[PDB]
Amino acid sequence: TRSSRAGLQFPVGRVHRLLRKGNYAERVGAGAPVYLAAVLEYLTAEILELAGNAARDNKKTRIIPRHLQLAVRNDEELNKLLGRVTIAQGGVLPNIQSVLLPK
Amino acid sequence: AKTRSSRAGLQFPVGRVHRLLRKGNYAERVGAGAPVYLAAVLEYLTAEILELAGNAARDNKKTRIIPRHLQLAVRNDEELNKLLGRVTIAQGGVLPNIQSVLLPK
Amino acid sequence: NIQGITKPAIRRLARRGGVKRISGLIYEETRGVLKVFLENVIRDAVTYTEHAKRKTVTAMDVVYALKRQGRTLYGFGG
Amino acid sequence: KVLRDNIQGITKPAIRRLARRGGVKRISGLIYEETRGVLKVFLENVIRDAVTYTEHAKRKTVTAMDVVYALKRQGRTLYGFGG
Amino acid sequence: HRYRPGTVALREIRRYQKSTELLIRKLPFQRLVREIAQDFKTDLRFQSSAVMALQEASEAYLVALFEDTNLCAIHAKRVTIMPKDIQLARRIRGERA
Amino acid sequence: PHRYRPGTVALREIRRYQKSTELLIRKLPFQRLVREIAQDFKTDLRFQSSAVMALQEASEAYLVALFEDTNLCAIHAKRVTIMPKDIQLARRIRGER
Amino acid sequence: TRKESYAIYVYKVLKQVHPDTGISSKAMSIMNSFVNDVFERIAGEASRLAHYNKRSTITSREIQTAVRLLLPGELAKHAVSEGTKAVTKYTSA
Amino acid sequence: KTRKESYAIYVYKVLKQVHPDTGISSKAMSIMNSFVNDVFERIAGEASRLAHYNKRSTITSREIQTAVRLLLPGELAKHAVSEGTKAVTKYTSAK
DNA sequence: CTCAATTGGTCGTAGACAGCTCTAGCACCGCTTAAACGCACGTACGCGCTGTCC
DNA sequence: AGCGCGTACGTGCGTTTAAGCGGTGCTAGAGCTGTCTACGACCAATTGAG
């Protein structure tokens, strides 16, 4: 196996397959799918880590879309990456503006 | 006629469009009608824009379309403005528009 | 149909949106804007469906329509 | 040569002219500073992208093309320069 | 007693930002969808999942619109959002021309 | 002597610049600024004069659009023109940071 | 150096539209940029449409639906009429 | 019958690498699969355009690199660049 | 349970990549004066409210 | 939100700056072209991960 050869969980083979079939270029150098799989596993790790931490915060045995939305919107960088993304069953962050609250 | 711009009755280079569609890796294969169709739509849009911009030039009393006129045309037509709403045109400036609040009473 | 988007439903949404106080005129405005929205999204989706020669609008058609609109939705396949 | 403070090359009258084309009649003296700020952030983003393209090209010259690509990637497509 | 008007509103905001389930009734939305689509094509079918996806996108869009509008109101120093606020919002977004 | 009333000249100016399309920022200042910012990213980068002018066209059109949005934010209670709160609002409505 | 541009084609168009009207160098430039832009947008959309249909041979139909997606409805309608007319002529030729 | 492929198993494996405790709901798993596909799309698209901008035929690991540096926020890009360099060096350390 | 991942190998060419120049982008002076600055000034529109409306 | 308050920033003007022109020098690396082969695609035969 190649992900073995690279220490990856994500399927280097299937990433190479998708890069080939996706017509992204005439040729896809063998280093490219390894690198992309690694990036796609550092991402995903990032967010699944934050979602599991949120699940601990929310005292849950399972990540539910709430936890993903919370993780994504609390992390300023993921919220930059995903600002034009919406997530099923995610809801929204607590947002009340100062003039709406009573003095 | 020999060209695929002829037979199509188009000025735009059907063979060039086909080449680009192949060269751009947009697909593995590009059916011969697709270049013709794309070329024709290209031509139509260029025509519509050049019409509006030429009219603006004419009412600017100028024979040469300059970016002023392209921007005026593109923003005066709501539909072109929707097609080009995110586009910035070098040296286009803005439509003359002052908010009525600002005008003296 | 359109009035099926009840006043309480719109209140609930605006509350999720953090709206404290609502002019009643907001309800018909919301209905109009939501209609326009749906219009555009469904038109794109059907246009994929028409191209696929399908009669069934699929979840993928909706996803791809939203991906076009700049509204990328996760939850139904990418 | 180290470059500094060139943000001040955005002269108050320049920002005024821009506000005029923008249809602003009266401009808060505060806007000029915030406007320099916003412009700086914007330039930062576009330049970062164009630089990254030059780095991929291994080119030591930032070209118009690289700026155009940056702006298109920014979703702000610029016509008049190619691309 | 009487809760001073506006005190339940904040409580409801707190609830509905805590909650994440969809807030429009499913069938009425579905029927509005079928109506709008009929205008474009006859004898259409929808996957239930496709309708739910439409509803998700529609609700999250509306929530973000309400947020922005609220901010416009606050800029108006108004607690009450108004049609002019929605108009300004969308205008700045460049949705409406 | 002669004095235009306040904003008379300002309106004449707006009319003027909406008629014209030249660059409103003075070029060489802008170029130096660009060089400075880029130096923060990478030393020893040469800028095609065209590439500069392109950055300038983009910056000007972007800021003009922003000012448009900001002036639209003026609207409530027949409030007039623009303040940094307006800029911040308009940007956040755009979803800019 | 053999830089391809739509300059000649755009000229021809304009000679249809306002032969008395010239296009400035920069205006021509902009039109070139626009043409390339819309080309890329339409072709990319046709590509994604092709992917969704697992079709590797972009036909005129993919271009047609892409155009219906990208262009606003009246501009789209006209573009469709032009495209189908051109394809009809080419088919008859 | 339809054997629809997904990254599900790899998402679960990575979850258990970050959190051996807890699981992920099928809904959140679908959202993760979506997110994976989206990021893959964005990156491969960027690398495609970088190649065409250079007229180069081959999307190399370097195209992916610069794409990641353009697309992701600076810190996230930084760490992603570290991870990709590490992974490519590991792969090229095996055969 | 099975067909997508996998390997060693060949092919041939993409692009490494090294040289080669001369494009045009670097500095540079230096004179002109449009524009920048800064100061005065003032009036109009940003601040305020409690009148009042639901 | 009418109307009061008031001092902010518009119109002006006089002075100072340096942007612009443009004229001139220099050079480095943009881009071209030519040589090689590292490389990715194709392939048959192989395996077990999803």
Swiss-Prot record, chain C:
Residues with Phosphotyrosine modification: 27, 64
Sites bearing N6-succinyllysine, chain numbering: 7, 53, 67
Modified residues (N6-lactoyllysine): 7, 53, 67
N6-(2-hydroxyisobutyryl)lysine, modified sites: 7, 20, 35, 53, 55, 67
GO cellular component: nucleosome; nucleus
Cross-link type Glycyl lysine isopeptide (Lys-Gly) (interchain with G-Cter in ubiquitin), residue numbers: 67
Keyword Ubl conjugation among UniProt keywords: yes
Residue numbers bearing the N6-acetyllysine modification: 7, 35, 55, 67
One MF annotation (Gene Ontology) recorded for this entry: structural constituent of chromatin
Record keywords, A-Z: Acetylation, Chromosome, Citrullination, DNA-binding, Hydroxylation, Isopeptide bond, Methylation, Nucleosome core, Nucleus, Phosphoprotein, Ubl conjugation
Highest taxon, organism lineage: Eukaryota
N6-propionyllysine: residues carrying this PTM: 7, 20, 53, 55, 67
Modified residues (Phosphoserine): 23
Keyword Nucleus in record: yes
Numbered residues of crosslink Glycyl lysine isopeptide (Lys-Gly) (interchain with G-Cter in UFM1): 7
One of the protein's GO biological processes: nucleosome assembly
Modified residues (N6-glutaryllysine): 7, 35, 53, 55, 67
Post-translational modifications reported in the UniProt record: Demethylation is performed by JMJD6.
Protein's cellular compartments: Nucleus; Chromosome
Modified residue annotations for N6-butyryllysine: 7, 20, 53, 55, 67
Family from the record: Belongs to the histone H4 family.
Oligomer and partners: The nucleosome is a histone octamer containing two molecules each of H2A, H2B, H3 and H4 assembled in one H3-H4 heterotetramer and two H2A-H2B heterodimers. The octamer wraps approximately 147 bp of DNA.
Function, as annotated: Core component of nucleosome. Nucleosomes wrap and compact DNA into chromatin, limiting DNA accessibility to the cellular machineries which require DNA as a template. Histones thereby play a central role in transcription regulation, DNA repair, DNA replication and chromosomal stability. DNA accessibility is regulated via a complex set of post-translational modifications of histones, also called histone code, and nucleosome remodeling.
Name this protein carries in UniProt: Histone H4
Organism: Xenopus laevis
Upper lineage: Eukaryota, Metazoa, Chordata, Craniata, Vertebrata
Residues of the full protein shown: 26 to 103 of 103
Swiss-Prot record, chain F:
Modified residues (N6-glutaryllysine): 19, 42, 78, 85
Annotated keywords: Acetylation, ADP-ribosylation, Chromosome, Citrullination, DNA-binding, Hydroxylation, Lipoprotein, Methylation, Nucleosome core, Nucleus, Palmitate, Phosphoprotein, Ubl conjugation
Record-level GO cellular component terms: nucleoplasm; nucleosome
Entry-annotated residues carrying Phosphothreonine: 43, 70
Superkingdom assignment: Eukaryota
PTM annotation (N6,N6-dimethyllysine): residues: 42
Residues recorded as bearing N6-acetyllysine in the entry: 19, 42, 78, 85
Entry keyword Thylakoid: no
Residue numbers bearing the N6,N6,N6-trimethyllysine modification: 19, 42
S-palmitoyl cysteine: lipidated positions: 73
Acetylation as UniProt keyword: yes
GO molecular function annotations of the record: DNA binding; protein heterodimerization activity; structural constituent of chromatin
Residues annotated with Phosphotyrosine modification: 4
Residues modified to N6-lactoyllysine: 19, 42
N6-crotonyllysine modification, residue list: 19
Sequence positions bearing N6-methyllysine: 19, 27, 42, 85
Residue(s) carrying N6-(2-hydroxyisobutyryl)lysine: 19, 27, 42, 85
Family (UniProt): Belongs to the histone H3 family.
Function: Core component of nucleosome. Nucleosomes wrap and compact DNA into chromatin, limiting DNA accessibility to the cellular machineries which require DNA as a template. Histones thereby play a central role in transcription regulation, DNA repair, DNA replication and chromosomal stability. DNA accessibility is regulated via a complex set of post-translational modifications of histones, also called histone code, and nucleosome remodeling.
Full protein name: Histone H3.2
Naturally occurring in which organism (per UniProt): Xenopus laevis (African clawed frog)
Lineage of origin: Eukaryota, Metazoa, Chordata, Craniata, Vertebrata
Curated annotation (Swiss-Prot), chain G:
PTM info: Monoubiquitination of Lys-89 by BRE1 gives a specific tag for epigenetic transcriptional activation and is also prerequisite for histone H3 'Lys-4' and 'Lys-79' methylation.
Gene Ontology MF terms in the entry: DNA binding; protein heterodimerization activity; structural constituent of chromatin
Keywords assigned by UniProt, alphabetized: Acetylation, Chromosome, DNA-binding, Glycoprotein, Isopeptide bond, Nucleosome core, Nucleus, Phosphoprotein, Ubl conjugation
Glycosylated residues (UniProt): 81
Crosslink site: Glycyl lysine isopeptide (Lys-Gly) (interchain with G-Cter in ubiquitin): 89
A GO cellular component entry from the record: nucleosome
Function (record text): Core component of nucleosome. Nucleosomes wrap and compact DNA into chromatin, limiting DNA accessibility to the cellular machineries which require DNA as a template. Histones thereby play a central role in transcription regulation, DNA repair, DNA replication and chromosomal stability. DNA accessibility is regulated via a complex set of post-translational modifications of histones, also called histone code, and nucleosome remodeling.
Family indicated by similarity: Belongs to the histone H2B family.
Protein name per the record: Histone H2B 1.1
Source lineage: Eukaryota, Metazoa, Chordata, Craniata, Vertebrata
Shown stretch of the complete protein: 33 to 125 of 126
